[PDB]
C-alpha cells in the first residue's frame, strides 16, 4: 500500500491548527518520514496513545528534520481529537 499512505497522528492547539506527533512512524512495515520543515510536536507516539481525547496537555513545539521533530524550545497547549 506504500510506506507513506498511513494516517499520521496529530494534535490540535487552541487556534485549531493541527501539528504532527513526531516526524516518523512505521507504515505497512516500512518507514514513513514527514517532509523537512513540517510543524510537529516533540511527543512520543506511545505517549500520544495514552492521551485522553480533548483534555489539554503541554506540547513542545518542533520542526521535522531528517525524520526527527527537532525542539524549538517553546511549549503550547495541545489536545487530542475524537
Amino acid at each position: 500500500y506504500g510506506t507513506d499512505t498511513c494516517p499520521f497522528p496529530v494534535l490540535a492547539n487552541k487556534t485549531n491548527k493541527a501539528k504532527f506527533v513526531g516526524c516518523h512512524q512505521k507504515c505497512n512495515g516500512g518507514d514513513q518520514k514527514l517532509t523537512d520543515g513540517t510543524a510537529c510536536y516533540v511527543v512520543e507516539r506511545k505517549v500520544w496513545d495514552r492521551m485522553t481525547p480533548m483534555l489539554w496537555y503541554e506540547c513542545p513545539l518542533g520542526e521535522c528534520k531528517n525524520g526527527v521533530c527537532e525542539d524549538l524550545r517553546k511549549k503550547e497547549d495541545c489536545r487530542k481529537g475524537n
Binding site: 506504500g2 494516517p7 496529530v10
Partner: protein, 63 residues
C-alpha cells in the same frame, strides 16, 4: 479527528476488503478518505478519485 494523511494509495482496494471509512479533519494539511480494511489496515485515499468516492457510497449503502 486525530490523524492526517500525507500521501494517497495509488491503486484499487477491492470492495470486499473494505470494512469502514472516515474523512480526516479539514484542519489537516490535505483532505483524505481513510479506509479501514477487514484486516485492520488504515489506507489514506484520494478523496477526489471517483473510485474512492464510489467505495464510500458503497460502504454507506451497507450501513
Amino acid at each position: 479527528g486525530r490523524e492526517c494523511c500525507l500521501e494517497y494509495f495509488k491503486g484499487a482496494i477491492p470492495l470486499r476488503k473494505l470494512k469502514t471509512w472516515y474523512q480526516t479533519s479539514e484542519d489537516c494539511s490535505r483532505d483524505a478518505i481513510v479506509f479501514v480494511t477487514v484486516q485492520g489496515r488504515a489506507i489514506c485515499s484520494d478523496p477526489n478519485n471517483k473510485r474512492v468516492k464510489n467505495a464510500v457510497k458503497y460502504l454507506q449503502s451497507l450501513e
